[PDB]
RNA sequence: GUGGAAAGGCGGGCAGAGGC
RNA sequence: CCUCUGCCCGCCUUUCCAC
């Protein structure tokens, strides 16, 4: 299909790569700011009925990365039958610890065809020392903060499929508030800030019954092949409960995801984004 | 005496008498001598069952086990009713133990009337072993050259075996260690290149024998070739996922005694599951082919009652591992119904490795689907009042967090006040008694049982008593079950009775004070175990790799056998009582921490000894780390696991120690670093001339960015150091290892 | 929460003497890819917050009417009595150091300090209103690093016994004096009554930093940073709603912090006062 | 309706002692 | 251009979560 690839060109560190529940949590806090409570609910209802956003993935200078489907994890031996038994062990493990794939290789992995993995990851995770100093005597109480530091021309992007009147109405305004307000924690040290660009991405896919996801779904039925995510964030200073999300690349079968709502003792209510982002995928016999 | 305890003990005493022929002390064929050796043992200090068990080494050679006549006369002559045994069931048990021997090693392993030979090593069939004990003390049985074992050395083997078998109880858990300690380095069949131990051929004959009995196969079902070719066996195989995120994801509040108790509690989770498969299926610990760092394989029977019990064990273990640990650790158990003919090579294709890769795929497809038997895994039921442990991160419902024994102003989860108390008892702890979950003294809980600590001055309680690092059932009640299990456990003590701290180790490193962290594992191990084509040959190749990492690593930290190690990069001479803590030592990998100084020399004292422990045909790969003492674990280990992975996907034989193109690589190879250290280090180990050294690293760091050549040339010249570094005026890239270490050895 | 607009201040931080903001032969912090030095946003925000809490602490009497909840503190540190929220101004023990952080949203709305830099306390907390970005090098000084010049130095300092004249020298790395940086500070207009005050207080604390030091040694000479503004643009709530470049720009390419704090506060921000 | 909110890597320290 | 010096000492996370 043809998606909308919202690039986020960073202006500093980030705290972590944004997952798709912290992108919808940020949009719901932007659209509550520039419009109000009576437009947050029309935002959720366009995702409940219609549109889908994904998680965010790194880019590095026109190479776009996408998560490896777990569909190629079993078949890998039957994938690689043009190799000898000295590198069918050493291709086979690097193609299994691999986390991301190019846009070209990802279109091959859905077809169950051979691929290569990225040589170089476009970001680094580092711990930067921070010291609290007493105003009267400058006593130091050092602590360590870990943030994502990007390369020169790398950044992060998420995808969006849905109607265009949602995109210009609720997402492209919110991703300009979020450019100057940041995404994630420590946004007052300049962390989750960015510029923003918009593009037209096309991803080829097969047609089948099963579909990868590119977002943390909160599935009603059990999926085909999954990988647990056990996160629960924060919401106006209250701790969310933890929720079993499924990581990107998990194969579901005709599952629409679902939004869970919570109460948390706020004047309004809290919708945890858990909708899936389907791409069709060709599986082996199980 | 029942029949299940007879078939288990008949196969375990079936190729007994193979040692006493090499000693040469009865009429020279083992199908009579082991008959004589057992009924002699039945006479003096003799149970009356040792006479009956010599119907198994007697009818061995199938010319004596021929045409159903000669047995029935003699088996009539005894008193088999005095044990309850029927005239037929005893006969039905000789055929099973006879069928089991052929599958195990097969009938192709059967040799002719050969002489005495050394057991060829399973890692290298050209070299061979001497004979020794399984001490784990003061002997590294490296494969030496072929030397025939002398015929009186077996008479020292038999005479100790006489006295040990006379004392030991007649039961499978009491004869497995006796035959292990003595008959490990004795070859099963004498031939050219034999790599199967005799204990492994007896450990595995009593496994396939009892899995034939529980399967229900009868003697005429063996006599007709019918218990073979039918899917009657069941390779249970189990595995853990997320061992790394379980042991090492602790905050900065968890001390080393806690981490050392996380590793010793993933063991008991692993031995609780295996010892519930063995007990509810009637099997013995001869069936456990290996149990090595979470990954264990068991041989069982294929009945619709066994598979019905495994699916409750896999149910109750995974539901346990989810209430306790919110999807950090999962247990994948699968089983493949194998036939009898798949226990060995047939035609030209290996049917055993082909039937074990069909089981590695059931497991591979299961670690994807991580908790698909909970039925509320994705049900977001909203539990309230969820606090959160500081040390590990666990949601805990409705408060209920015990005050920490360290600082009662902080509230930890209950299962870390256990692992502090357990982590404090690790000096004294001689094992664990495994018993019912609601009982006095139980610290930790497994999925099935509850584990008391059997301390030193204290009576053991429990049905089964696990004993760390000895094959001697010393002070156990005569009714309990003895499970020996080995653990790599070298901790430097403090002057208290306890395990030394991240501080207290690193305050004894000469130089700058760092916490050295090494993590490494055997290169390409799974392709070693696929040429093992019989279940006696896989059980051999799996113990010897496990014994290296359990018991021949604590020998290395002692510094024993520097003959076979030699001269290694040593900042100081290796002390008498090193300050090294062995956190986790797995069958194919290990995670050791200690001073930066001595964890450096140990990482070359390990590669050099492993290379000789094999014949050379298996190599290591190490990550090494230098850290501040007060660094958290999850940051430290995630670095070094990556820094081990860095020194692996390059070329997989590379030590890590301390240009954006793609033609360089960060990790030194082994001989490369040991040849850089032979030259560059004995010349500079220049009194307080560190500006010669520290600028030379900055001269080096223009080369990454041939301006460096004359800059070094004036610098080596404006002091007068011409002998030092002649080829330094790419060798400027590979001197960063030796400089940056020796600089740390001098403040 | 009543968002109105965001005021963005862009200017160049300039190192008149050699800046040093360490890491732990004593490295200033660096980008892990380019390797060029930078000034953090934690380290510039907190040096402005520090110098301004010392500023308010001296004035807990004059400011009781313009700022409510400043009558609950008496000037000092609550270090002597190991209880937080006692009657002193520095009242939150972070680890070992005592910082003014207001206890409660309805008091931190009335402090001059915690309204701008934010505060944390049970029963909710006040998020900061500023975002101090990291200050990387300008492109003129990348292209001196590309050109092959130096961009940090290694300075050698010694300590000396005063009786025996025995010397035991140590070396600090510090960024070469002259290096131009590029900062950005994004205020958040959450209320329209106090936006002038929060900008006059943010420029007060930037004027203290031009006679104090940023980072490192400073008492021995490592600070001496200079602020050089370029342009202040106020982004209205409607601008985000549409993405049309329709926002007030106060242009001052060559002005100090004392030439903008009171000299042009009502002459330059008069168009920002109009649109609210 | 954001794994969030608040949190200066700093305090002190003559590259100097003799040597036409 | 020769002779001693060539980093010390510290904090190394604190606190918030409405049944
Ligand atoms: Zn805990
Ligand atoms: Zn305040």
Q: Smallest CA–C1' separation from A240: which nucleotide?
A: E17
Distance C162 CA to D19 C1' (A): 22
CA of C167 to C1' of E4 (A): 9
Q: Counting Cβ atoms within 10 Å, is residue B211 exposed (0-12), middle (13-18) or buried (19+)?
A: buried
**Cα-Cα-Cα-Cα dihedral sign, residues C61, C63, C69, C75:** negative
- Chain C residue closest to A143 (CA)? C95
Residue with tokens 């890239």: B733
The region, left, alpha or beta by phi > 0 then psi within -120 to 50, assigned to residue B386 is beta
Please name which of B161, B148, B132, B139 lies closest in space to residue B37, comparing C-alpha atoms.
B161
State whether A218 and B527 contact (CB < 8 Å): no
Q: Rounded to whole angstroms, how far apart are CA atoms A29 and A24?
A: 9
A286 inside 8 A of chain B by CB: yes
| B397 alpha carbon – ligand 1 mean position (Å) | 13
Number of A:B CB contacts under 8 A?
57
- Minimum distance, in Å, between the CA of residue C40 and any CA atom of chain A: 7
Q: Pick out the nucleotide with least CA–C1' distance to A265.
A: E18
Instruction: Name which of A160, A240, A144 is nearest A198 in CA terms.
Output: A160
| Experimental determination technique | cryo-EM
Nearest to residue B285, comparing CAs of B293, B296, B294? B296
Coil, helix or strand for A160? Answer: strand
Q: Is A98 helix (H, G, I), strand (E, B) or coil?
A: coil
Rounded to whole angstroms, the Cα distance separating A245 from A229 reads: 5
CA distance C164 to chain A (A): 31
Interface of C with A in 65-124 (CB under 8 A): 76-77, 79, 90, 94-100, 118, 124
CA-closest candidate to residue B583, choices B535, B515, B667: B515
End-to-end CA distance of chain B: 70
Please state, in angstroms and rounded to a whole number, the distance separating the CA atoms of residues B621 and B623.
7
How many whole angstroms separate alpha carbon A163 and alpha carbon A140? Answer: 53
* Separation between the CA of C137 and the C1’ of D2 (whole angstroms): 30
Q: Which helix (H) or strand (E) holds A202?
A: strand A194-202
Distance from CA of C195 to the nearest CA of A (A): 18
For nucleotide E1, give the residue with the nearest CA to its C1': B718
Q: What is the 3-state secondary structure (H, E, C) of B405-465?
A: CCCCCCECCHHHHHHHHHHHCCCCCCCEEEECCCCCCCCEECCCCEEEECCCCCCCCCCEE
Chain A 30-69 residues whose Cβ is under 7 Å from strand D: 30, 32, 37, 40-41, 44
In angstroms, rounded to a whole number, what is the distance separating the alpha carbons of residues B550 and B485?
A: 10
Q: Which of A33, A139, A193 sits opposite C3 (nearest CB)?
A: A33
What is the H or E stretch that residue B599 is in?
helix B598-613
Q: Who among residues 157-186 of C has its Cβ near strand E, under 7 Å? A: 166-172
Report how far residue A258's alpha carbon sits from residue A220's, in angstroms, rounded to the nearest whole number: 7
Tell me which residue of B346, B303, B89, B90 sits closest to B211, measured CA to CA.
Answer: B303
Q: Which domain holds residue C10?
A: 1-276
Closest CA to C235 of C188, C168, C178: C188
Environment class of B721 (CB within 10 Å of its CB; exposed 0-12, middle 13-18, buried 19+):
middle
Can you tell me the distance from the alpha carbon of A15 to that of B150, in angstroms, rounded to the nearest whole number? 69
**Side-chain half-sphere exposure of C50, counting CA atoms within 13 A:** 22
Which residues are CB-neighbours of A175 under 8 A, at least 6 positions away? A6, A8, A27, A30, A196
**Breaks (C–N over 2.5 Å) after residues, chain B:** 658, 685, 705, 729
Instruction: Please state the domain count of chain C.
Output: 1
Please identify which residue in the block is written with the tokens 């009356």.
Answer: B48
Give the contacts of B150 (CB within 8 A, at least 6 positions apart): B116
Cα four-point dihedral sign A232, A217, B323, B283: negative
Residue owning tokens 């229900």: B216
Q: Which of B165, B123, B126 is nearest to B145 (CA)?
A: B126
- Distance of alpha carbon B579 from alpha carbon B492, whole angstroms: 5
- SS (HEC) of B357-393: HHHHHHHHHHHHCCCCCCCCCCCCCCCCCEEECCCCC
Q: What is the CA radius of gyration of chain C?
A: 21
Number of Cβ within a 10 Å radius of residue A224: 20
Locate the chain A residue with the closest alpha carbon to C44. A189
C218 touches strand D (CB under 7 A): yes
Integer distance in angstroms from CA B511 to C1' E7? 14
List strand E contacts in B 403-422 (CB < 7 A). 409-410
Q: Give the span between the Cα atoms of C75 and C47, in whole angstroms.
A: 20
> How far is Cα of residue A82 from the mean position of the Cα atoms in its chain?
34
**Best CA proximity match to B581, nearest among B259, B292, B140:** B259
- Residues of chain C (202-261) having a beta carbon less than 7 angstroms from strand E: none
**Residue that the structure tokens 């939150």 belong to:** C92
Regarding beta strands C88-90 and C74-77, do their DSSP bridges make them parallel or antiparallel, or are they unpaired? parallel
Contact B205, B22 (CB under 8 A): no
Among residues B60, B611, B380, C63, which one has the least CA distance to residue A246?
B380
Contact across the interface for A260 and B380, Cβ inside 8 Å: yes
Q: Is the CB of B691 under 7 A from strand E?
A: yes
Angle at C96 between CA C91 and CA C101, to 5 degrees: 30
Nucleotide nearest to A37 (CA to C1'): D1
Task: Assess C130–A contact: CB distance below 8 Å, yes or no.
Answer: yes
Cα B291 to middle of ligand 1, angstroms: 27
Q: Which CA distances in Å does C210 have to A153, B102, B412, C227, C231? A: 34, 90, 47, 7, 19
C99 CA to middle of ligand 2, Å? 10
Give B364 to chain A, closest Cα distance, Å: 7
> How far is residue C184's CA from residue A11's CA, in Å, rounded to a whole number?
11
Tell me the torsion sign for CA atoms B158, B162, B163, B168: positive
Resolution in A: 3.1
Tokens 């937080």 — which residue?
A: C84
> CB-based contact (8 Å) between A70 and chain B?
yes
A50 contacts: CB under 8 Å, gap ≥ 6: A162, A163, A166
């Amino acid at each position: 299909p043809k998606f909308i690839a919202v690039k986020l060109i960073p202006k500093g560190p980030f705290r972590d790569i944004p997952r798709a529940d912290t992108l919808f949590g940020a949009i719901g806090n932007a659209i509550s700011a520039i419009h109000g409570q009576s437009a947050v609910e029309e935002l959720v209802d366009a995702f409940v009925g219609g549109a889908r956003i994904s998680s965010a993935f790194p880019y590095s200078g026109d190479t776009y990365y996408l998560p490896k489907p777990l569909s190629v994890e079993p078949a890998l031996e039957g994938i690689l039958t043009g190799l000898d038994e000295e590198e069918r062990y050493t291709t086979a493990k690097r193609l299994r610890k691999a986390k991301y794939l190019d846009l070209k290789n990802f279109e091959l992995a859905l077809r169950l065809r051979p691929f290569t993995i990225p040589e170089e990851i476009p970001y680094a995770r580092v711990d930067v020392p921070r010291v609290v100093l007493d105003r009267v005597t400058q006593d130091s109480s050092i602590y360590f903060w870990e943030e994502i530091r990007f390369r020169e021309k790398s950044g992060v992007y998420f995808l969006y499929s849905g109607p265009r009147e949602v995109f210009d109405g609720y997402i492209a305004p919110a991703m300009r508030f979020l450019g100057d307000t940041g995404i994630g924690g420590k946004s007052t040290w300049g962390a989750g800030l960015f510029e923003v660009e918009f593009h037209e991405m096309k991803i080829d896919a097969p047609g089948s019954e099963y579909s990868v996801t590119l977002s943390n779904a909160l599935p009603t039925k059990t999926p085909v092949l999954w990988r647990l995510l056990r996160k629960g964030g924060w919401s106006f200073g209250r701790r969310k409960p933890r929720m079993t999300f499924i990581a990107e690349g998990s194969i579901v079968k005709n599952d629409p995801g679902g939004m869970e709502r919570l109460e948390l003792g706020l004047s309004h209510e809290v919708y945890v984004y858990g909708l899936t982002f389907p791409l069709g995928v060709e599986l082996p016999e199980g | 005496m029942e029949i299940d305890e007879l078939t288990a003990l008949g196969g375990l005493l079936h190729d007994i008498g193979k040692p006493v022929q090499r000693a040469g002390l009865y009429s020279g064929d083992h199908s009579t001598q082991g008959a004589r050796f057992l009924r002699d043992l039945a006479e003096n200090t003799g149970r009356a069952e040792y006479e009956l068990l010599s119907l198994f080494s007697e009818f061995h050679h199938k010319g004596h086990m021929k045409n159903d006549e000669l047995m029935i006369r003699r088996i009539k002559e005894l008193s088999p009713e005095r044990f309850g045994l029927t005239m037929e069931d005893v006969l039905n048990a000789l055929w099973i133990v006879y069928e089991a021997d052929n599958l195990a090693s097969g009938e192709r392993e059967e040799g002719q009337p050969q002489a005495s030979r050394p057991l060829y090593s399973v890692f290298n069939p050209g070299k061979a072993y001497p004979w020794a004990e399984l001490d784990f003390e003061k002997e590294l049985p490296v494969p030496g050259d072929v030397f025939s074992i002398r015929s009186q050395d077996y008479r020292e083997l038999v005479k100790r075996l006489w006295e040990e078998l006379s004392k030991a109880k007649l039961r499978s858990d009491r004869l497995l260690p006796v035959l292990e300690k003595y008959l490990t380095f004795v070859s099963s069949v004498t031939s050219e290149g034999n790599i199967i131990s005799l204990y492994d051929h007896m450990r595995m004959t009593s496994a396939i024998a009892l899995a034939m009995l529980r399967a229900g196969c009868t003697a005429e079902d063996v006599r007709s070739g019918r218990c073979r070719k039918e899917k009657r066996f069941l390779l249970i195989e189990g595995d853990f996922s997320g061992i790394q995120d379980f042991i090492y994801r602790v905050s900065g509040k968890g001390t080393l005694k806690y981490l050392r108790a996380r590793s010793a509690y993933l063991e008991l989770i692993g031995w609780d599951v295996v010892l519930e498969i063995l007990s509810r299926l009637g099997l013995t610990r001869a069936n456990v082919v290996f149990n090595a760092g979470g990954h264990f394989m068991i041989i069982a029977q294929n009945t619709p009652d066994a598979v019905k019990e495994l699916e409750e064990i896999r149910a109750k273990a995974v539901e346990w591992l989810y209430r306790e640990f919110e999807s950090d650790l999962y247990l994948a158990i699968e089983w493949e119904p194998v036939s009898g003919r798949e226990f060995g090579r047939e035609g030209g294709k290996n049917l055993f490795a082909e039937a074990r890769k069909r089981l590695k795929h059931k497991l591979t497809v299961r670690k994807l689907k991580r908790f698909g038997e909970i039925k509320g895994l994705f049900e977001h039921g909203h539990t309230e009042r969820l606090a959160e442990c500081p040390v590990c991160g666990r949601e805990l419902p409705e408060g209920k967090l015990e005050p920490s024994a360290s600082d009662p102003e902080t509230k930890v989860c209950p299962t870390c006040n256990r692992l502090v108390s357990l982590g404090g008892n690790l000096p004294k702890l001689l094992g664990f008694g495994r018993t019912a979950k609601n009982d006095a003294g139980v610290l930790v809980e497994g999925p099935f049982s509850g584990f008391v600590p059997y301390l030193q001055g204290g009576r053991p309680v429990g049905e089964q008593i696990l004993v760390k690092n000895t094959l001697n059932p010393g002070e156990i009640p005569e009714s309990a079950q003895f499970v020996p299990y080995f653990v790599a456990d070298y901790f430097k003590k403090d002057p208290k009775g306890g395990v030394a701290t991240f501080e207290e180790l690193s305050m004894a490193s000469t130089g700058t004070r760092r916490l050295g962290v090494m993590k490494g594992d055997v290169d390409r191990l799974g392709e070693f175990f696929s040429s093992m084509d019989s279940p006696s040959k896989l059980a051999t190749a799996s113990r010897f790799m496990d014994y290296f990492f359990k018991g021949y690593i604590g020998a290395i930290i002692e510094g024993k056998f520097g003959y076979i190690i030699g001269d290694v990069p040593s900042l100081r001479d290796w002390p008498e009582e090193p300050d090294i803590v062995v956190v986790y030592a797995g069958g194919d990998d290990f995670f050791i921490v200690g001073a930066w100084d001595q964890i450096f020399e140990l990482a070359f004292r390990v590669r050099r000894a492993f290379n000789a422990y094999t014949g050379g045909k298996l190599t290591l790969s190490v990550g090494l780390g230098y850290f501040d003492e007060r660094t958290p674990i999850y940051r430290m280990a995630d670095v070094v696991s990556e820094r081990l992975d860095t020194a692996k996907d390059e070329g997989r034989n590379r030590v890590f120690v301390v240009p954006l193109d793609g033609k360089h690589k960060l990790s030194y190879e082994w001989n490369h670093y040991e040849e850089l250290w032979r030259t560059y280090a004995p010349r500079i180990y220049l009194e307080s001339k560190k500006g010669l050294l520290w600028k030379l690293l900055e001269i080096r760091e223009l080369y990454v960015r041939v301006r460096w050549a004359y800059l070094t040339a004036y610098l080596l010249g404006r002091h007068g150091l011409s002998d030092l570094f002649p080829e330094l005026v790419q060798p400027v890239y590979w001197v960063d290892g030796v400089l940056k270490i020796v600089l740390m050895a001098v403040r | 929460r009543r968002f109105y607009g965001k005021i963005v201040i862009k200017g160049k931080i300039k190192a008149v003497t050699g800046l040093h903001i360490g890491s732990q032969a004593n490295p200033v912090i660096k980008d892990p890819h380019t390797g060029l030095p930078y000034i953090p946003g934690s380290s510039l925000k907190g040096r402005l917050r520090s110098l301004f809490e010392i500023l308010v602490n001296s004035r807990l009497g004059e400011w009781r009417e313009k700022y409510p909840s400043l009558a609950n503190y008496s000037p000092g540190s609550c270090r002597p009595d190991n209880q937080e929220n006692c009657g002193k101004f520095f009242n939150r023990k972070i680890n070992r150091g005592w910082i003014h952080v207001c206890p409660d949203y309805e008091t931190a709305l009335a402090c001059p300090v915690c309204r701008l830099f934010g505060a944390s306390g049970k029963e909710s907390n006040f998020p900061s209103r500023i975002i101090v970005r990291d200050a990387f090098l300008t492109k003129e000084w990348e292209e001196k690093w590309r050109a092959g010049e130096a961009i940090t130095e290694a300075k050698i300092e010694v300590g000396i016994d005063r009786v025996t004249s025995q010397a035991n020298p140590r070396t600090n790395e510090r960024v070469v004096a002259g290096a131009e940086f590029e900062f950005e500070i994004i205020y958040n207009v959450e209320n329209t009554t106090h936006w002038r005050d929060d900008i006059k207080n943010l420029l007060t604390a930037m004027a203290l930093l031009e006679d104090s030091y940023l980072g490192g040694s400073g008492s021995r000479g490592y600070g001496k940073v200079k602020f050089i503004f370029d342009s202040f643009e106020f982004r209205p709530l409607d601008y985000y709603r549409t993405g049309k470049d329709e926002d007030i720009v106060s242009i001052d390419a060559r002005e100090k912090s004392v030439s903008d704090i009171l000299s042009g506060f009502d002459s330059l921000f008069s168009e920002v006062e109009g649109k609210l």
